[PDB]
Design a protein around this nucleic acid. Structure first.
Ligand SMILES: Nc1ncnc2c1ncn2[C@H]1C[C@H](O)[C@@H](COP(=O)(O)OP(=O)(O)[C@H](Cl)P(=O)(O)O)O1
Ligand SMILES: [Cl-]
Ligand SMILES: [Cl-]
Ligand SMILES: [Mg+2]
Ligand code: NA
Ligand code: NA
Ligand code: NA
Length: 326
DNA sequence: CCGACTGCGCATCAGC
DNA sequence: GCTGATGCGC
DNA sequence: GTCGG
């Protein structure tokens, strides 16, 4: 990629501030800076040039000057040498371990992958499954496997009830050649903003996917969100596929377009789009777009009949999923 | 300068 | 138990 | 850490 050095540097700084400093705004600021530079269709030749971009200010511009001149950042060099920082950054790579638990473990002398395996009784359930599939969860998913996975999920959902609709979102819907996980949007005519005519709607789908050994583990589960682990079946003598993260989101069917807009992302595109909505006087979530009145209180849901309607409200030209990879 | 920074489900904990 | 805050991940 | 007002 065109400014890969700079965006990697900024991502490492973002990870440091979230994981180690526990400074969530610095984290979001670095990620915004990285995203706008990754977008920029010119090889950046100075910090001043990059400062022209929205979300690059004085401090990042100076870091960019250091990096272009020397190929590195002293601040990052030091972070990498610091044992406490390095240990906490590593521990947050386990799904379910964040900045707080990572620092808790390191304070206790639990600093390595071995230390976790030796201390499984100190992990909650999510962290336990994350440790178990730590290696698997580092591997990306080729689109060819996502297509197999899509085909399994959609057919099994159909066998539970043919009125379900399951839509694979995330990077897959944006056309990516590889995905980090599988995100499935689900709807059913019984569950709308106005009524829930049948419960267990998500449960029945999860149960059927466990029955056929597609879903292998559960990280968390509720009435509308499932987060867990799945695996493609392998053939005779074939090495097994890696285990994969899967998230299933049950959205009221009349709220499908806000739901699919949300679950298609990217996360930074969503953040940017919701920022713009506020500037235009609306608030967007995965259910509705609503105005902000005189008090900045969210009013009543606006009528939405397409993803593009959402764009129309905030005065953005429609962007196809493949152009939302920010 | 400096207040605001996207929005929310599920798990866990704390205080009653 | 419930409620609200926090942790974590999406 | 950045920025609109
Ligand atoms: N912090 C956030 N704020 C708003 N929307 C978010 C969000 N995080 C995620 N979403 C929305 C927007 C996301 O697109 C959707 C899925 O989240 P996933 O973490 O799986 O992101 P992806 O795009 O699929 C990644 Cl490129 P990969 O999974 O291939 O590694 O959820
Ligand atoms: Cl901060
Ligand atoms: Cl809502
Ligand atoms: Mg995803
Ligand atoms: Na700027
Ligand atoms: Na983690
Ligand atoms: Na996900």
């Amino acid at each position: 990629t065109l400014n890969g050095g700079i965006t990697d540097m900024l991502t490492e700084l973002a990870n440091f501030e979230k994981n180690v400093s526990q400074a969530i705004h610095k984290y979001n600021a670095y990620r915004k800076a990285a995203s706008v530079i990754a977008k920029y269709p010119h090889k950046i030749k100075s910090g001043a040039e990059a400062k022209k971009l929205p979300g690059v200010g004085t401090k990042i511009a100076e870091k960019i000057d250091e990096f272009l001149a020397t190929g590195k950042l002293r601040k990052l060099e030091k972070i990498r040498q610091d044992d406490t920082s390095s240990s906490i950054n590593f521990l947050t790579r386990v799904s379910g371990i964040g900045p707080s638990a990572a620092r808790k473990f390191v304070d206790e002398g639990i600093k390595t992958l071995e230390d976790l395996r030796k201390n499984e009784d100190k992990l909650n359930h999510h962290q336990r499954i994350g440790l178990k599939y730590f290696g698997d969860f580092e591997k990306r998913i080729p689109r060819e496997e996502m297509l197999q996975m899509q085909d399994i999920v959609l057919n099994e959902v159909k066998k539970v009830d043919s009125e379900y609709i399951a839509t694979v979102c995330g990077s897959f819907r944006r056309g990516a050649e590889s995905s980090g996980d599988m995100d499935v949007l689900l709807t059913h005519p019984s569950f709308t903003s106005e009524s829930t005519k049948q419960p267990k709607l998500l449960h029945q789908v999860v149960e059927q996917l466990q029955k056929v050994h597609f879903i292998t583990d559960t990280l968390s589960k509720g009435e509308t969100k499932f987060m867990g682990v799945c695996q493609l079946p392998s053939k005779n003598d074939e090495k097994e596929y890696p285990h994969r993260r899967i998230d299933i989101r049950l959205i009221p069917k009349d709220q499908y377009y806000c739901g699919v807009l949300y679950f298609t992302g990217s996360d930074i595109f969503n953040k940017n789009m919701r920022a713009h909505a506020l500037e235009k006087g609306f608030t967007i979530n995965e259910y509705t777009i609503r105005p902000l009145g005189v008090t900045g209180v969210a009013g009543e849901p606006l009528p939405v009949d397409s993803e593009k309607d959402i764009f129309d409200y905030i005065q953005w030209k429609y962007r196809e999923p493949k152009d939302r990879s920010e």
